[PDB]
Design a protein around this nucleic acid. Structure first.
Lengths: 265, 43, 290
RNA sequence: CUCUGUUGGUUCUCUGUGCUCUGUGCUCUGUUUACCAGGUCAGGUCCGAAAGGAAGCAGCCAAGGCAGAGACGCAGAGCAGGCAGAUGUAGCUGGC
C-alpha cells in the first residue's frame, strides 16, 4: 500500500516499488520519476495519473474488415478470438472465423469447438497445409456472401527464429492480393506474467507486418501486466482490449483510468 | 545444403567422368549443370 | 555482464548518496522477480530476500558512501554459499553404489556415460547397470555408449525382483574387481505412486551411499515439487545439473537445495561423454544474475 | 574319214540329294556408345502456399551398333569326296 499524504521522500519511493513490480521497464520507469520531481504539486495522487494516461494514449470500431491476430507461445491466441466473437455479435455485426493453426496438434480443432457454441462458421482445412492461403479463401467468401468482420488465426511462433517470421509476411500479401485496402488492423496478444521479454517481441512484430493495436490476456491473477507502457513510447502503437478470464463474456473495453487504479494497488 | 549440392553434381556424371575428372571440358560442364539444376560456376 | 533487470536496479543507486530502509526493500523486490524469469520458484525467492535483508543491516549499508557496491557484493556471496561454496567431490570408499534418478527427458542415460570416463583415467573401475524396462530401446542406448568408452553393461530382464538383481551385481564386481557401480533408472513423475514405491524398495535391498538426482536447466516453477517428493519418500544425497550449453540460466539448482540441504556435485556442458566438469558456484553466480 | 551302245574331256544353265561360304531379312547371343530433336527418369532443382505439376541428365531400357554358335527359308559365287540322275554341245587326239 502506498501512503498518499506524507512527505516528498516517501511518496516517490513507494511509487517505484509498485511500478517495477508491474513489469514496466528500464528506461520507462526512470522517465516517470524525473517528470514528477520537476513539477511541484501538492496533490500527488492526481499528478501521477495524468502522466500515465499520456504514455498509453498517442465502443471501439475497427478501421477495416479483415483483422490479423498474431502472437507467441503460451499466450492463448485461440482463446482471445473466442471473446471477440461474443462482443461484436450483440451490436449487429456478421462475424466469421478462420482456422490457421495447423502446425500445432489439436490447434485447428480448438476453434471448431468454440464455433459451434457461438453459432459462427469456421473455415477449416487438413493437417500440414499453408495457413496463409487458407486466409485467402476466407476473403473471397466474405465479398461474395456478405459478411462484416473476419478474424485470422496464426501458429505458435517465436521472435528469435527467422524461418517462421518470413512465413508471417506471406499472410500479409495473400489478403492484399484479393483486396488492396485490407489489412488495416493488426492486433497482438501478450501475457501478463511476461517480464522484459515482451519489449523485444513488440519490436520484431512491427518490423514484419506493422502493428496498430495490442491486446493483453490473463489479468485476473496476481500479475498486473503493465508491459504495455514502453511500447507506446517508442513505436507509438495504441492499446485496444483487455482479457479478464477464460470465458466468452470476459472481455471489457480499455479504460485508461481503471488500468492505472489497479496498477498501484 | 552445401553437401547435397556437391553430391548432385556427381550424380549427373557418367562412370567415365567420375574415374577421370580431367576430361570434363566446356561441352560436358553444361550437361552436368543443366541436369542438376546448377550453374557453370558451381561445377 | 549483468542482466536487463539488474542493470537498472543497481545502476540507479550510483551517484545519489546515502540510502534509507525503504530503498533496500525496493531493490530486493527486483532481485526476487529477476529469479522468477531465470526459472526459480516464488517460495524460494521470498526466503532468499529475507536472508539478505538481515545481512545488509549487519554490514551497515545505510551509513555507507557507496550503496551499489555493497548490495551487489552481498547477493554474489549469498548465492555462492547457497549453491555449495567451493568445488566439492564425493567421498570414494572401497565399494561405491551410485544411483541416477530423474524425470522424463532429463538425460539420465547421457550422464551415465560421462561418469564412466571421468573416473576411469584416475584409477577407479566403473560398471554400468540398466534398470530401464518401460522405455523402448533404452537398454540398447546404454550399450552403444558403453562400447564408446569401454565399460561393460549389465542388462536387467522384464519383470525381475529386487532380490535377484543384487545377486548378479555382487558376482560381477568380485570376479572382474569393479568398485564403482552406476545404476540407471527409469523416468517417473512426482505424483505417480506405483513407480515411486518400487524405487523405495530398490533402495532398501541394495543399500547405496550417494544418490544423484539429474535435473534439467529448463525446469520452471515445478522445481520445488520434484525435490520434496524425492527426498521424503526415497532419499536424495546429491544433485547434478545437465544441459548448460544453450541460452538457459540454470536456476533450478537453487530451488532444490533450499528444501533438502544437500550439495550439488557435477555439471554437464556437452552431449559427448568427454564433456564433464565439476560444479563451480562462482560460474553459476554470474549466469543467474546475468 | 555318218551316228550310234558300254566308254572319255571342257564351257553352259539348271532340277533333286545333303553339305559348306556370304549378304543379309530379321532374329538370337557377347561386346560397344557423354550432350546433338526416343521411353522411364532416383537425387537436385525449379513454378506454387499448398494440394498438385512440369522439364530433365545419369543410369538403365529402347534404338544405332560390333561378332560368333542357330533350324532354316530365301540365293549367288566357291572347290574338290559322292555311286550318280534330266535335254543340247563344238573344236583336237585317241579306244570301242
Amino acid at each position: 500500500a502506498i501512503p498518499w499524504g506524507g512527505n516528498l521522500e516517501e511518496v516517490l519511493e513507494e511509487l517505484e516499488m509498485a511500478l517495477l513490480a508491474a513489469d514496466v521497464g528500464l528506461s520507462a520507469t526512470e522517465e516517470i520519476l524525473q517528470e514528477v520531481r520537476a513539477s511541484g504539486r501538492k496533490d500527488l495522487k492526481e499528478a501521477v495519473k495524468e502522466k500515465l494516461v499520456g504514455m498509453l494514449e498517442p465502443p471501439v470500431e475497427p478501421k477495416g474488415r479483415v483483422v490479423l491476430v498474431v502472437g507467441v507461445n503460451g499466450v492463448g491466441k485461440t482463446t482471445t478470438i473466442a471473446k471477440l466473437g461474443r462482443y461484436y455479435q450483440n451490436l449487429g455485426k456478421k462475424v466469421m472465423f478462420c482456422a490457421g493453426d495447423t502446425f500445432r496438434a489439436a490447434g485447428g480443432t480448438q476453434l471448431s469447438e468454440w464455433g459451434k457454441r457461438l453459432s459462427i462458421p469456421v473455415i477449416q482445412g487438413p493437417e500440414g497445409t499453408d495457413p496463409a492461403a487458407l486466409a485467402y479463401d476466407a476473403v473471397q467468401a466474405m465479398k461474395a456472401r456478405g459478411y462484416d468482420l473476419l478474424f485470422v488465426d496464426t501458429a505458435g511462433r517465436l521472435h528469435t527464429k527467422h524461418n517462421l517470421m518470413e512465413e508471417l509476411k506471406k499472410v500479409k500479401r495473400a489478403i492484399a492480393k484479393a483486396d488492396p485496402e485490407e489489412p488495416k488492423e493488426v492486433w497482438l496478444v501478450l501475457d501478463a506474467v511476461t517480464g522484459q521479454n515482451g519489449l523485444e517481441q513488440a519490436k520484431k512484430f512491427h518490423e514484419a507486418v506493422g502493428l496498430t493495436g495490442v491486446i493483453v490476456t490473463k489479468l485476473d491473477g496476481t500479475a498486473k501486466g503493465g508491459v504495455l507502457i514502453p511500447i507506446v513510447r517508442t513505436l507509438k502503437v495504441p492499446i485496444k482490449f483487455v482479457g479478464v478470464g477464460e470465458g466468452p463474456d470476459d472481455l471489457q473495453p480499455f479504460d485508461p483510468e481503471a488500468f492505472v487504479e489497479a496498477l498501484l494497488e | 545444403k552445401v553437401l547435397v549440392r556437391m553430391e548432385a553434381i556427381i550424380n549427373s556424371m557418367t562412370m567415365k567422368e567420375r574415374a577421370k575428372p580431367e576430361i570434363i571440358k566446356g561441352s560436358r560442364k553444361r550437361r552436368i549443370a543443366a541436369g542438376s539444376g546448377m550453374q557453370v560456376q558451381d561445377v | 555482464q549483468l542482466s536487463a533487470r539488474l542493470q537498472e536496479a543497481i545502476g540507479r543507486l550510483r551517484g545519489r548518496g546515502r540510502i534509507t530502509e525503504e530503498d533496500l526493500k525496493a531493490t530486493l523486490r527486483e532481485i526476487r522477480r529477476a529469479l522468477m524469469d531465470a526459472d526459480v520458484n516464488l517460495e524460494v525467492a521470498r526466503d532468499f530476500v529475507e536472508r539478505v535483508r538481515e545481512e545488509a543491516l549487519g554490514k551497515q549499508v545505510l551509513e555507507s558512501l557507496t550503496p551499489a557496491e555493497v548490495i551487489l557484493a552481498t547477493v554474489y556471496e549469498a548465492l555462492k554459499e547457497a549453491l555449495g561454496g567451493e568445488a566439492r567431490l564425493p567421498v570414494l570408499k572401497d565399494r561405491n553404489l551410485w544411483f541416477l534418478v530423474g524425470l522424463q527427458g532429463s538425460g539420465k542415460t547421457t550422464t551415465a556415460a560421462k561418469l564412466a570416463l571421468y573416473y576411469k583415467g584416475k584409477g577407479r573401475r566403473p560398471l554400468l547397470v540398466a534398470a530401464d524396462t518401460q522405455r523402448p530401446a533404452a537398454r540398447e542406448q546404454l550399450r552403444l555408449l558403453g562400447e564408446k568408452v569401454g565399460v561393460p553393461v549389465l542388462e536387467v530382464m522384464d519383470g525381475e525382483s529386487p532380490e535377484s538383481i543384487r545377486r548378479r551385481v555382487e558376482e560381477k564386481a568380485r570376479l572382474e574387481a569393479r568398485d564403482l557401480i552406476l545404476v540407471d533408472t527409469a523416468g517417473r513423475l512426482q505424483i505417480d505412486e506405483p513407480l515411486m514405491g518400487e524405487l523405495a524398495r530398490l533402495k532398501e535391498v541394495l543399500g547405496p551411499d550417494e544418490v544423484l538426482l539429474v535435473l534439467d536447466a529448463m525446469t520452471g516453477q515445478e522445481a520445488l515439487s520434484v525435490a520434496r517428493a524425492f527426498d521424503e519418500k526415497v532419499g536424495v544425497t546429491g544433485l547434478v545439473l545437465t544441459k548448460l550449453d544453450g541460452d538457459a540460466r540454470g536456476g533450478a539448482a537453487l530451488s532444490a537445495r533450499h528444501v533438502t540441504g544437500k550439495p550439488i556435485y557435477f555439471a554437464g556442458v556437452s552431449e559427448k561423454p568427454e564433456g564433464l566438469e565439476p560444479f563451480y558456484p562462482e560460474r553459476l553466480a554470474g549466469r543467474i544474475l546475468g
